[PDB]
Every structure is written in structure tokens, then in C-alpha cells.
Design a binder for this molecule. Structure first.
Ligand code: SF4
Ligand code: SF4
Lengths: 144, 140
């Protein structure tokens, strides 16, 4: 999970990074500066995680490509208003014990932290309304 | 000059309204029941020698939707029928087209005459099959 400048001055132990909302991992840290768009950074991360799925279990094999396609829409500015709430649901349902191994829980850990700390750049992607259906002549639709 | 005895009963005689020993036509409408079938068989017997019978509606042509223990599957099982008018209920215009289809039989005589072999399924076929466009149903 991503951490902020406020999360420095904090020791590099397993339970100290654990109480800060993240995991200590390999202990090799990566710095993100002010010129990297967070949505593009997460989209690069999820693209790696989606394509490195072994394909055994459904919420990794099929859940993660949906997250990638939403982030590509957010990065280009084609995001729809239900998209961010889908990313939240994906993170909840790809947690520990719901998938077959720990690959998928590790994949959603950057995604859920970046929405929590940087929601404004994710909200900036939403510039188009919701439409996943096309009109059919002679059939009046069900108007919500 | 055709005298009609209408035995329409329920939900098929309401269209007819919108549209003994004296009649030559018996327009059976409505559902024919096992219990009331002798009544229609005696009324058919009472009439004179040149009888004509028009069945209108699915409940009189066949059993219709009532393929059930208490309904006979068509009035043609026990009385001869001349014209069949599908629908549930048929239209008054259909009743008019039945009398027009029946005067042709009254003027064509064993009244088949090798001319009644032509059927409205084959006669209006080139009319119906050449239809391409129909009005969209989202409008009145
Ligand atoms: S979560 Fe693990 S087991 Fe399931 S598809 Fe992904 S890599 Fe394979
Ligand atoms: S044919 Fe249809 S409308 Fe006529 S009596 Fe039977 S159910 Fe009613």
C-alpha cells in the first residue's frame, strides 16, 4: 500500500508499517514525486498484476482485468460515475482468503491506498456519464 | 337472405352484440362444454334441411386454451361446421367476412365444386408475404 510524507519518521519494522495501513514487504522503498499522475501509476501497476495472474481462480483471472480497463478509462478521461465504486468493491472482494493465493490481495493493496489518499485525481477521470446500452427502435427502455 | 341463430355464450358474444325452427345459420361462439353439448346438438337437429354452421373463436374451433377435463375440444367433434373464424374473441369485421365467405359457398354448388380447394392461406399469400415494413409499437 502507498504511504505519504506523514507516514515517514516511522520505523521500518513489520508491525510498525502494519499499523500504518501497509506491509513492509521486501523493505525496498520506491519514491513517487509530484510529477507522476497517480492514476497512471496505478494503471501501470494493475497491468502488471493482471497479466501475471496464473489464471487458476476467478477473482484474480477476471476481477483484475476489469480494474485495468476502468483505470485506462480514468487515465484517458472516459470514466463513468459508477467506476470508482467498482474499484472499491474489487479491492474488498480480492482480499485475503477470497482468492486462491496471495497474488490478488497484493495486487489491490496499491489500488485501495491510492484511492484513499489521492481520490481527487481518480475523480478527475470521471468526465462522461453512464451508458452501457444502445437504443433499439420500437422498444421503449426501462427508465431507471 | 340468411337467418342467424346465435348461441354465443360468454366473452365471445360481447363482440357479436357490437356487430327456433326458423334459422338456416347457427353461429356457435364461446366455449363448448361437455355438460351443455346436448343442448347444441338438439338445436342443430331442430333446424331444417339446408343447414350452415359458422364456428368463431378458438374455444369453438378447437378447445382453444382450455385443453381441460370439462371442455370439449371443438364443436366440429359433434356438429358439422362450414366456416372457421380464428381469434379470442374475433372481430365484428371478421363476422362480416365470414358471411361474405359463406355466400360464396351458398352460390357455389357436395358444395366444394373443385373451387373451394382454393384457400385464403394461398389466395392472400402474395398479399401477405410481400409486406416489408410495419408501424413501430411505441406510438398510437
Ligand atoms: S490469485 Fe493466485 S491462484 Fe488465483 S489466479 Fe491469481 S495467481 Fe492464480
Ligand atoms: S374463444 Fe376466447 S374470447 Fe371466445 S369464449 Fe373462448 S376464451 Fe373467450
Amino acid at each position: 500500500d502507498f504511504l505519504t510524507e506523514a507516514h515517514l519518521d516511522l520505523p521500518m519494522e513489520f508491525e510498525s508499517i502494519g499499523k500504518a495501513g501497509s506491509r513492509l514487504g521486501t523493505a525496498l522503498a520506491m519514491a513517487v514525486d509530484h510529477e507522476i499522475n497517480m492514476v497512471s501509476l496505478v494503471r501501470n501497476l494493475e497491468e502488471f498484476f493482471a497479466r501475471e495472474s496464473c489464471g487458476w481462480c476467478t477473482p484474480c483471472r477476471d476481477g483484475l482485468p476489469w480494474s485495468v480497463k476502468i483505470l485506462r478509462a480514468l487515465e484517458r478521461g472516459e470514466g463513468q460515475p459508477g467506476d470508482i465504486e467498482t474499484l472499491e468493491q474489487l479491492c474488498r472482494f480480492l482480499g485475503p482468503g477470497k482468492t486462491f493465493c496471495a497474488h490478488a490481495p497484493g495486487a489491490v493493496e496499491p489500488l485501495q491506498s491510492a484511492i484513499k489518499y489521492f481520490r481527487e485525481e481518480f475523480e478527475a477521470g470521471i468526465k462522461q456519464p453512464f451508458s452501457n446500452t444502445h437504443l433499439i427502435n420500437g422498444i421503449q427502455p426501462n427508465l431507471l | 337472405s340468411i337467418w342467424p341463430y346465435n348461441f354465443g355464450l360468454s366473452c365471445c358474444y360481447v363482440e357479436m352484440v357490437t356487430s327456433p325452427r326458423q334459422a338456416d345459420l347457427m353461429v356457435v361462439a364461446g366455449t363448448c362444454f361437455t355438460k351443455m353439448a346436448p343442448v347444441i346438438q338438439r338445436l342443430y337437429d331442430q333446424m331444417l334441411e339446408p343447414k350452415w354452421v359458422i364456428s368463431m373463436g378458438a374455444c369453438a374451433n378447437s378447445g382453444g386454451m382450455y385443453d381441460i377435463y370439462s371442455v370439449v375440444q371443438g364443436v366440429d367433434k359433434f356438429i358439422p361446421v362450414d366456416v372457421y373464424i380464428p381469434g379470442c374473441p374475433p372481430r365484428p369485421e371478421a363476422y362480416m367476412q365470414a358471411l361474405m365467405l359463406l355466400q360464396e359457398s351458398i352460390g357455389k354448388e357436395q358444395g366444394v365444386y373443385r373451387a373451394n380447394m382454393q384457400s385464403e392461406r394461398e389466395r392472400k399469400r402474395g398479399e401477405r408475404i410481400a409486406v416489408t415494413n410495419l408501424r413501430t409499437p411505441d406510438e398510437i
